[PDB]
Amino acid sequence: SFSGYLKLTDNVYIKNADIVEEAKKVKPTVVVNAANVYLKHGGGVAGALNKATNNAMQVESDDYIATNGPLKVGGSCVLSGHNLAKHCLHVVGPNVNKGEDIQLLKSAYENFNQHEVLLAPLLSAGIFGADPIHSLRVCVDTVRTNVYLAVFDKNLYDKLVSSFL
Numbered sequence: 001s002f003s004g005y006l007k008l009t010d011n012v013y014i015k016n017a018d019i020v021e022e023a024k025k026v027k028p029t030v031v032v033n034a035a036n037v038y039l040k041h042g043g044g045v046a047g048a049l050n051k052a053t054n055n056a057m058q059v060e061s062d063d064y065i066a067t068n069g070p071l072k073v074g075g076s077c078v079l080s081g082h083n084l085a086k087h088c089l090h091v092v093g094p095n096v097n098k099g100e101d102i103q104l105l106k107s108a109y110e111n112f113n114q115h116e117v118l119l120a121p122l123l124s125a126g127i128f129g130a131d132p133i134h135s136l137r138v139c140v141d142t143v144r145t146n147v148y149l150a151v152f153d154k155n156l157y158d159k160l161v162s163s164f165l
């Protein structure tokens, strides 16, 4: 199971870790992907998770989009976790760099409540352009299930922990 996490609340845990390496080690029931509406896993967490699956995540995702169309910003879908997890929950947080509404971040985190335990990144952080301190606050105030957050950057991890109220 999950090791080396700092407990932030009753249900939220955090660790400075590469989510791909963390997923390969823990093999969780659910790994969350920082997805976009088209499930085009080009970069950030999505590009890294997809590269770890040898592009199998992208092939599965393209079939899903061909059948269902794009996801909504704030929405999600459950697909295979491939070699990373039993399932991957692809969650679309708002991308501030694409002019998407930051208010949709709470709706994005609500998807996590459908799963008892998840390994996840901070939604809308990184290349999605939102403030990760804000993302962690929305996570803590929205997710009620057990969430294990992997924060890749040590400097950001220390800022998140030291500023956590």
Ligand SMILES: C[C@H](O)CNCc1ccc2c(c1)OCO2
Binding pocket: 001, 026, 027, 028, 029, 081, 082, 083, 084, 085, 086
């Ligand atoms: C409670 C237990 O840790 C859940 N494991 C699910 C799980 C099974 C097989 C996997 C995997 C994930 O990633 C790749 O092969």
